[PDB]
Design a protein around this nucleic acid. Structure first.
Ligand SMILES: [Zn+2]
Lengths: 288, 251, 1340, 66
RNA sequence: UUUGAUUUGGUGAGAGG
DNA sequence: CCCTGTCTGGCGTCCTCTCACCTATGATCATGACGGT
DNA sequence: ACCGTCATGATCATATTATTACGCCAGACAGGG
């Protein structure tokens, strides 16, 4: 509503302002009193899909597990690696970021002391054991689950993890709601992934691949920023380069899909006939 | 069973079975009498629809009804639904040795103990008090003990403080969402009629004190007392199982 | 000037806006609707006359008989309200109807009937309404609640977005009749037009246009324009109006008059349209490709062959043009089917149609209604004339015809109740216009489309359904009997009518049990706009938008008073000034702001008349004439608030209290509370309980007197005068002579209602509040009710509160209360429980109520009399015997000698077992009232004869005192008349007083008046004779009762529940709380005067739960008590009235331009002392809702008392005796006790009874039951490793019967051990699955 | 998806305590299905020790002694 | 060849958390 | 024959507390009150 | 005051019709390019 409620509660609200306030608050009470049914039915579906899964071994005997990286949406690094790899047992032994060192062994639980020795060495990402990669028939082994979470140690042989997991996902169901180009922020080094590129005539490295990931790696080794750069964008920078904080490093036009080339030469109209294939629309306000 | 009065409040299945038997008797009599084809086709069709209405009512076209327009409840409707046997009597049951009252604060408590009223304590612990009274030798038969606690003499409160002492109880707030909503305490007896609940523990139950109610349950057997002390005690739940964050945070 | 009870305690009033329309009578919806229902109403409608003239005359199955209608009449009820609530009857009135039977002859139904008969007939019993606005159905006072539903008429909704998953919106046009078959026109993604009738199968829409006897040529004449092609010598020229060409790209070069107008490849501009219409171009030239797809309108036939050239609604090709060109046709009529302007929806619809004439359309409609049966032309005509076009089965109301004409832009709002052809064609025209892009759709939640039914209209509809069942019965009987020998009471029977109206008032979804524990709760349950019930939506299905406040609830439906939980916004409460329109919509007052001046005339606007005009906000500043003092003023135009100029306004609101309801206008400082906390405050103010001595609100809104007087708990004076006799039972008013009838001499007697049971087990008392010899005015309180005081409304009590954290005992929301509160007996509420005991009739004989009872001794029977029933006054405990009743013996041991009765003793030797029916415990009390009802024929025992003699004696004394008191008033009238005209000063009292008529006086008005008083006196004599005989008949007779019951004993226990840790108290802003510790007096924080504070709240509930109004209420309450303490100081020192007059005048002026303006110079030195006697416990202050007391006025009133300006006193501690740092806030808050007590929720069970079908414990508290260890608790014990706890929690403690008896033996012997077994309810699951064709087992 | 996955289980009491019981009981009846219990809700239905918590030693013992 | 106290079902409406 | 609207079934939160309200009938032997002798 | 006639209450099988106004969301089905 274009006219706000300029009066607080210490000054008096008049009539219209309180009525607009009642719009805004009746919507919230209706949302909670109808949201609670979906939250409870979500907890029910979750504890009946889980329902069976019991910690029933001590090691499945595998070497597979998901690759825990810190998550980065495009702003500053949102959830650090110490939040994701706290108390989860590594899959293979993590190499120290210098060269080929056995920093942690390959079946150690990562409690707070190990995670601090991970944060000192600025470890990139940890290949850690996940429950979906567990090889145990009819249950989850004790290492592929992780830390007990309300006990400091590993999960005991027996403790029902499906039900506590289903409750822990569905329990915050009440608090949840129901109803141009790239500008860098920090100052570091450039790295490109999924890149197949070419240098244009002016010098800005344009990209012949749609799915290119533009990472900003710091001077330490960890990945601090990530972005998605489209097919055919004007990169102000290049691979492995050092930039300044706030300098624009990418540019494109999303309303005009570029059909840029790899080589040079002359242009011919192959199967382009005016009258059937293409049409003649001379511009009104420009003339070109 | 009859309700309070002189008539029998009959179940719906008796209507269903009585109709199937009425129709089956009619069909046997018509096959005795050699009625023509269309009569016994309607008779067997009414029996088919009667059996199909008995088993799963309303899966066929519009369900039959006795009183008044509401359809009557069949066997499959004794199984299925929110109020069948699974979701209403086998997964969740009503429970003896249990109680319920309004909560209040009582901040003098240590966080392994909760306040529990004397009237609820003498009602929930009637068999332990009976066993204690029969051990001392104050009475003889069970009747005498039930008269003693029906009168509430001066000697059963010492018996009650000697059955409480190291015996945990399960406090439970009514919308239990995660496992920290059932926690086991040790009772401390309360002159009053309200459960005194230690304040830090409230942030686990999502329990404010604006009119809330909680249920108490008594672990009867010995393995259940040990599970209440060793797994479900309130000192043992100081970290939320969803993460690593402490749940006994000062509110 | 002020009324005499307004000179008792005149409430201080802040407030700035001078009112112009006072609060109306708050119960006008119920009373006005039911007065509209039952009243002798001529000119047909509304009322019962509408039903009796729409279902009658019943004419027979061609037997030439007819049962027509004359009139109706309701006799008096046999039972008045008090006897009806005591005994348990309906409060009904018999409905006598005068019906007439006429019987026509042969060969002339337009001929003379041979015989008529007109007579009185009995049908049904409709329950009357009491003066409070409530019904008494079976001794329990019930309220029928107004329903909010959809307005009958057309409704053009748009199924937006969701269908077909391609964004193409649909448009449907639901015609909503008031009674009959629905009708939904709609579209489909192929842009065809589909009708449907009552959500049945779907047909193309034009099949009904053929059913109204339209040929296809006429249909295309209606729904399209025409395009004319003239074959004139060159390329089949065209008549062209260029308005159709607005933006169309032509296929050639349009030239005319030898001039190129339009080029090929371009579109026709608007200026080219101007050129062609300025030069008046008519005939243009088309190519052969232009009429390649033009759609012909009507049929062309060739004159030679007699065949069809081209059918109607067909595109034209080359060969069709070649055929019609050589047949002699020069004019070609086609249609204009554009992309944006006019789609060919009718044309595609007629191309999907298989039907061709009227008969096939009627056959297809008869086949979609009743599937799979042979149609016949007579049956199809009869069905389609009885769907929409008959007075019987289809009826829009006047509301329906108004909406149907208004939403189609008609002029006359009057029409027939049935549809016609023009109506359906206008629906299809408006639907096609909405699809074309002009015009708008209609929203649902807009209150111009939500009608309000009430008690009268719903009772009329249920009575009409009863009448159509009885017209089925009368049509059955009338032409299947011998005539003339019967009368019209042998035909019509009263069973379906009484069954229908008794089922509606008895158990409906809207005839609900009155929440009666408070005058506020009565007067806000009667004003309720429920959306649920029959014809409306349901809670567990819908929805989102209907639970939201629309912009047109402003001043009709309250935005902040609604129940939170599963139905928010469906159980809306109607606002204060909101009336109901003539049709049923909502309307609200406004003030007609003519061009400069706010004129003080009120003017009621509906919900759609409000939108067109522009309404000024309620609190806009104006300078003594009406001229708006600003030049930008905040207004709202069309559902949207904005800022408008000074003199473009058309209306102003009346008073600033009109957005809210009466539940949430007793909240002081409402504009400072966030709306959630105001909602919770209004709902808990409804949930209060009446205390023992209700005090007053120190900080009210002035709305208390409307809620108290305009409800029915106080004893309002009817005619003013002088009080003659006050008593705790009765009050006698002597009526003043300038208010008094000439005859029926008249002094009124108010019989108050002493201690009796309410519905919520409170104690509805009435206390007399007037002195003796005191004048009272017409329209004035005499007896305060429950939670009233001097005619005000005192729900809870006002106590000294401090906001400080005090050692944790008020942690989340808790409240900490001194023992000074419980010592003063000030929350000690009084509850009354009714305990019934019936004497049924079983086998081996009837029961015994006598006190010769087995298995009991002296200690039980000392509290009973010699006939079983407990005394009146015996203070009992929990588990004594109230009524002794013996029969329980069952069949412990089958009688050896079959039925050996006459052998040992008289009847039997106590069967085999005996146990006098002894009751439970948990509650104390004092037996205040015992009722004994006896089914007639049964021997009355000695106590039933004692109650009969008692009530005979009471009614005898009461009617004799009626005669004596009215005779005393009559003799006082005779003395008042004989002051002049033959006065005898000494001779008047020498003779006996009954002869004051034959004294010396001529034929004047005085001897005429003495003759009229002799007529009145002899009428009172014979009336007293016949009424005492009838009252002896009513006491002496039996009562009709249940099948097979001897006598019913009802006993009223009267518990007095005080306060304890665990009760729920709350203020009036949402500050809830369980009281957590009842401290001693010494521990309370006191101040540097000495007084302890009573209640210590918690400050931390204020910044999060944003209810900042309670702190302003606290400061203004402390100001009020400061003025009260200064009055108490100036009066305790025995000071003369001059200083009291000075100080009371200074405390009543004190403000800005306000409304009160009192002066004590016209109170005359005796009322000022009594006004100060009423102000010494504090000075009441009114603070209206949105025009309240600002901060500076509270500061100036805290400066009048010698209190600190900031409101905060420094407070010492009670324990340490040393000062709290940073001085704390004290004041008075008006706090309410709620009836969620703690000795009604607390429950405990070791081992009780067990259910029958599944061997699990019972549920509830009255049934001694156990708490449900539900499913999520089972999940929470699976989530730990607790395995034995869950095994005994669902096998031993709950279900397995041998397991739990082994458990009970093992617990009383000290061996904690369980033998598990199986749940018996799992065996019930096996029997229910096995009772199907399924074979479930248990292997191994 | 979770409701299609909990109704497609090799234990028909687990898939019958949850949503529609008609479909699951006819599928299990005409298949002749058998419920080797082996989970939490089968043992909450049938009234014995949970095979997760303290009862995991009891179910180790019973699974060893077959 | 003689020991026993035992059982209160669906439907719909409303409130608390 | 592979997309496709269209129709039919199947979900929709736990715990608790208070109150009221509960199918019609169509046919007949035998008991029960009323009037004549 | 006794005998006969009208009236009125027990027990007992007989077996189903004249409203609409949720919102997805899978899952199966006749239609047609
Ligand atoms: Zn594993």
């Amino acid at each position: 509503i274009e006219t706000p409620i300029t009066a607080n509660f210490r000054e008096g609200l008049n009539v219209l302002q309180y009525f607009i306030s009642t719009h805004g608050a009746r919507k919230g009470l209706a949302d909670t009193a109808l949201k609670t049914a979906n939250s409870g039915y979500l907890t029910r579906r979750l504890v009946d899909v889980a329902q069976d899964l019991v910690v029933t071994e001590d090691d499945c005997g595998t070497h597979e597990g998901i690759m825990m990286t810190p998550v980065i949406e495009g702003g500053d690094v949102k959830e650090p690696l110490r939040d994701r790899v706290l108390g989860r047992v590594t899959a293979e032994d993590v190499l120290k970021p210098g060269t080929a060192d056995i920093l942690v062994p390959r079946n150690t639980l990562l409690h707070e002391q190990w995670c601090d020795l991970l944060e000192e060495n600025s470890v990139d990402a940890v290949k850690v054991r996940s429950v979906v990669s567990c090889d145990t028939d009819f249950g989850v082994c004790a290492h592929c689950y992780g830390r007990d979470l309300a006990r400091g140690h590993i999960i005991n042989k027996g403790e029902a993890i499906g039900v506590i997991a289903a409750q822990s996902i569905g329990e915050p169901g009440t608090q949840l709601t129901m109803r141009s180009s790239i500008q860098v922020k920090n100052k570091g080094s450039i790295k490109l992934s999924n890149v197949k590129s070419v240098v244009n005539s002016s010098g800005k490295l344009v990209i012949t691949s749609r799915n290119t990931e533009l990472k900003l790696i710091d001077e330490f080794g960890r990945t601090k920023e990530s972005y998605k750069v489209p097919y055919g964008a004007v990169l102000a920078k290049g691979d492995g380069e050092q930039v300044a904080g706030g300098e624009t490093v990418a540019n494109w036009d999303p309303h005009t899909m570029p059909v840029i080339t790899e080589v040079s030469g002359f242009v011919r109209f192959t199967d382009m006939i005016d009258g059937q294939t293409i049409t003649r629309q001379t511009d009104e306000l420009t003339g070109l | 069973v009859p309700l309070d009065g002189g008539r029998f409040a009959t179940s719906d299945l008796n209507d269903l079975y009585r109709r199937v038997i009425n129709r089956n008797n009619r069909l046997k009599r018509l096959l005795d009498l050699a009625a023509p084809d269309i009569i016994v086709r309607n008779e067997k069709r009414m029996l088919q629809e009667a059996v199909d209405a008995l088993l799963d009512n309303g899966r066929r076209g519009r369900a039959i009804t006795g009183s008044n327009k509401r359809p009557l409840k069949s066997l499959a409707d004794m199984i299925k639904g929110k109020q069948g046997r699974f979701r209403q009597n086998l997964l969740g049951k009503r429970v003896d040795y249990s109680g319920r009252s309004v909560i209040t604060v009582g901040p003098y408590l240590r966080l392994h103990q909760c306040g529990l009223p004397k009237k609820m304590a003498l009602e929930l612990f009637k068999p332990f008090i009976y066993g204690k009274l029969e051990l001392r030798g104050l009475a003889t038969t069970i009747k005498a003990a039930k008269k003693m606690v029906e009168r509430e003499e001066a000697v059963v409160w010492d018996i009650l403080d000697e059955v409480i002492r190291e015996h945990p109880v399960l406090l439970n707030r009514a919308p239990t969402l995660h496992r920290l909503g059932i926690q086991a305490f040790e009772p401390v007896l309360i002159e009053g009629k309200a459960i005194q609940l230690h304040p830090l523990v409230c942030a686990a139950y999502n329990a404010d004190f604006d009119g809330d109610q909680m249920a108490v349950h008594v672990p009867l057997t010995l393995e259940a007392q040990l599970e209440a002390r060793a797994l479900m005690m309130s000192t043992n739940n100081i970290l939320s199982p969803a993460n690593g964050e402490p749940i006994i945070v000062p509110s | 000037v002020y009324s005499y009870t307004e000179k008792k305690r005149i409430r201080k009033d802040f407030g700035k806006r001078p009112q112009v329309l006072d609060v109306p009578y708050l119960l006008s919806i119920q009373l006005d609707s039911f007065q509209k229902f039952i009243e002798q109403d001529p000119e047909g409608q509304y009322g019962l006359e509408a039903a009796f003239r729409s279902v009658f005359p019943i004419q027979s199955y061609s037997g030439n008989s007819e049962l027509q209608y004359v009139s109706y009449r309701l006799g008096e009820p046999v039972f008045d309200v008090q006897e009806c609530q005591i005994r348990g009857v309906t409060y009904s009135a018999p409905l006598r109807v005068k019906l007439r039977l006429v019987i026509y002859e042969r060969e002339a139904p337009e001929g003379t009937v041979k015989d008529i008969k007109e007579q009185e007939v009995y049908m049904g019993e409709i329950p009357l309404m009491t003066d409070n606005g409530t019904f008494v159905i079976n001794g329990t006072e019930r309220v029928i609640v107004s329903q909010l539903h959809r307005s009958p008429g057309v409704f053009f909704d748009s199924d937006k977005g969701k269908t077909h998953s391609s964004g193409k919106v649909l448009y449907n046009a639901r015609i909503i009749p008031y009674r009959g078959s629905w009708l939904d026109f709609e579209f489909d993604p192929k842009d065809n037009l589909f009708v449907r009738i009552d959500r049945r199968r779907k047909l193309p829409a034009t099949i009904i246009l053929r059913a109204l006897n339209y040929t296809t040529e006429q249909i295309l004449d209606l729904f399209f324009e025409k395009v004319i092609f003239e074959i004139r010598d060159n390329k089949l020229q065209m008549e062209l109006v260029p308005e159709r060409l607005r933006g169309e790209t032509a296929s050639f070069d349009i030239e005319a008059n030898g001039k190129v107008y339009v080029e090929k490849g371009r579109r026709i501009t608007a200026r080219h349209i101007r050129q062609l219409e300025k030069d008046d171009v008519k005939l243009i030239e088309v190519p052969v490709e232009y009429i390649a797809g033009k759609v012909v309108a009507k049929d062309y036939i060739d004159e030679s062959t007699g065949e069809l050239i081209c059918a109607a609604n067909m595109e034209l090709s080359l060969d069709l043009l070649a055929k019609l060109s050589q047949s002699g046709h020069k004019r070609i009529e086609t249609l204009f089917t554009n992309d944006l302007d006019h789609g060919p929806y009718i044309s595609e619809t007629l191309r999907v149609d298989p039907t061709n004439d009227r008969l096939s359309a009627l056959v297809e409609i008869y086949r979609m209604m009743r599937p799979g049966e042979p149609p016949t032309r007579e049956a199809a005509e009869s069905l389609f004339e009885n769907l929409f076009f008959s007075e019987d089965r289809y009826d829009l109301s006047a509301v329906g015809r108004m909406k149907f004409n208004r939403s189609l832009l008609r002029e006359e709002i009057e029409g027939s109740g049935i549809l016609s052809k023009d109506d359906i064609i206008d629906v299809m025209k408006k639907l096609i216009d909405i699809r074309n892009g002009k015009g708008e759709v209609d929203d649902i939640d807009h209150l111009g489309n939500r009608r309000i039914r009430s008690v009268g209209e719903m009772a009329e509809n249920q009575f009409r359904v009863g009448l159509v069942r009885v017209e089925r019965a009368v049509k059955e009987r009338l032409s299947l009997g011998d005539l003339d020998t019967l009368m019209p009471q042998d035909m019509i029977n009263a069973k379906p009518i009484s069954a229908a109206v008794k089922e509606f008032f008895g158990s409906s979804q809207l005839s609900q049990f009155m929440d009666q524990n408070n005058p506020l709760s009565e007067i806000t349950h009667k004003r309720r706009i429920s959306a649920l019930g029959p014809g409306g939506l349901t809670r567990e299905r819908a929805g989102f938008e209907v639970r939201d406040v629309h912009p047109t609830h402003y001043g009709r439906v309250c935005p902040i008073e609604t129940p939170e939980g599963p139905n928010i916004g469906l159980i809306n409460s109607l606002s204060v000034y909101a009336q109901t329109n003539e049709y049923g919509f909502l309307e609200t007052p406004y003030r007609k702001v003519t061009d400069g001046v706010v004129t003080d005339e009120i003017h009621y606007l509906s919900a759609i008349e409000e939108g067109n005009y522009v309404i000024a906000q309620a609190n806009s500043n104006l300078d003594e004439e009406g001229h708006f003092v600003e030049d930008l003023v905040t207004c709202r135009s069309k559902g949207e608030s904005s800022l408008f100029s000074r003199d473009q306004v058309d209306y102003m609101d009346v008073s600033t209290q009109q957005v809210v309801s009466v539940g949430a206008s007793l909240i002081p400082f409402l504009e400072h509370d966030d709306a959630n906390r105001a909602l919770m405050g209004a709902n808990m103010q409804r949930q209060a309980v009446p205390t023992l001595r209700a005090d007053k609100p120190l900080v009210g809104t002035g709305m208390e007197r409307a809620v108290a007087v305009d409800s029915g708990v106080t004893a309002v004076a009817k005619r003013g005068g002088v009080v003659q006799y006050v008593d705790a039972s009765r009050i006698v008013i002597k009526v003043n002579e300038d208010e008094m009838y000439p005859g029926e001499a008249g002094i009124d007697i108010y019989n108050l209602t002493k201690y009796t049971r309410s519905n919520q087990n409170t104690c509805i008392n009435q206390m007399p509040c007037v002195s003796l010899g005191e004048p009272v005015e017409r329209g004035d309180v005499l007896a305060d009710g429950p939670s009233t005081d001097l005619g005000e409304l005192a729900l809870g009590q006002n106590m000294r509160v401090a906001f400080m954290p005090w050692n944790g005992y008020n942690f989340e929301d808790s409240i900490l209360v001194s023992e000074r509160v419980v010592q003063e007996d000030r929350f000690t509420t009084i509850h009354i429980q009714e305990l019934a005991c019936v004497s049924r009739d079983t086998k081996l004989g009837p029961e015994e109520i006598t006190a010769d009872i087995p298995n009991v001794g002296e200690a039980a029977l000392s509290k009973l009399d010699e006939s079983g029933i407990v005394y009146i006054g015996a203070e009992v405990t929990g588990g004594d015997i109230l009524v002794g009743k013996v029969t329980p013996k069952g069949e412990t041991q089958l009688t050896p000698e079959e039925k050996l009765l006459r052998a040992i003793f008289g009847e039997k030797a106590s069967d085999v077992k005996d146990s006098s029916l002894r009751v439970p415990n948990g509650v104390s009390g004092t037996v205040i009232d015992v009722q004994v009802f006896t089914r007639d024929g049964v021997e009355k025992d000695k106590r039933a004869l004692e109650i009969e003699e008692m009530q005979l004696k009471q009614a005898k004394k009461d009617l004799s005192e009626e005669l004596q008191i009215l005779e005393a008033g009559l003799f006082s009238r005779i003395r008042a008349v004989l002051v002049a005209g033959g006065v005898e000063a000494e001779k008047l009292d020498k003779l006996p007083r009954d002869r004051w008529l034959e004294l010396g006086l001529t034929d004047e008005e005085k001897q005429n008046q003495l003759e009229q008083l002799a007529e009145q006196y002899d009428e009172l004599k014979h009336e007293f004779e016949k009424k005492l005989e009838a009252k002896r008949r009513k006491i002496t007779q039996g009562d009709d009762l249940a099948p097979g019951v001897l006598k019913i004993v009802k006993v009223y226990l009267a518990v007095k529940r005080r306060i304890q840790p665990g009760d729920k108290m709350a203020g009036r802003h949402g500050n809830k709380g369980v009281i957590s510790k009842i401290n001693p007096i010494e521990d309370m924080p006191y101040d540097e005067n000495g007084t302890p504070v009573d209640i210590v709240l918690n400050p931390l509930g204020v910044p999060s739960r944003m209810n900042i109004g309670q702190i302003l209420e606290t400061h203004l309450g402390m100001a009020a008590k400061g003025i009260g303490d200064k009055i108490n100081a100036m009066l305790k020192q025995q000071q003369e009235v001059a200083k009291l007059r000075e100080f009371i005048q200074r405390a009543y002026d004190l403000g800005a331009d306000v409304r009160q303006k009192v002066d004590l110079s016209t109170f005359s030195d005796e009322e000022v002392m009594r006004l100060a006697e009423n102000l010494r416990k504090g000075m009441p202050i009114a603070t209206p809702v949105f025009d309240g007391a600002k901060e500076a006025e509270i500061k100036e009133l805290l400066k009048l008392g010698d209190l600190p300006t900031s409101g905060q006193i420094r407070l010492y501690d009670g324990r340490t005796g040393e000062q709290f740092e940073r001085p704390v806030t004290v004041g008075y808050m008006y706090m309410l006790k709620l009836n969620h007590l703690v000795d009604d929720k607390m429950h405990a069970r070791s081992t009780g009874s067990y259910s029958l079908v599944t061997q699990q414990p019972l549920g509830g508290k009255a049934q001694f039951g156990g708490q449900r260890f539900g499913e999520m608790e089972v999940w929470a014990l699976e989530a730990y490793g607790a395995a034995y706890t869950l095994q005994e929690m669902l096998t031993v403690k709950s279900d397995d019967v041998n397991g739990r008896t082994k458990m009970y033996k093992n617990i009383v012997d000290g061996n904690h051990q369980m033998e598990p077994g199986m749940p018996e309810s799992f065996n019930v699951l096996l029997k229910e699955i096995r009772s199907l064709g399924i074979n479930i087992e248990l292997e191994d | 998806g979770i409701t299609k996955a909990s109704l497609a289980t090799e234990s028909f009491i687990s898939a019958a305590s949850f949503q529609e019981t008609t479909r699951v009981l006819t599928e299990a009846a005409v298949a002749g299905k058998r419920d080797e219990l082996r989970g939490l809700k089968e043992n909450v239905i049938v009234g014995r020790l949970i095979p997760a918590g303290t009862g995991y030693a009891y179910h180790q013992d019973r699974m060893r002694r077959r």
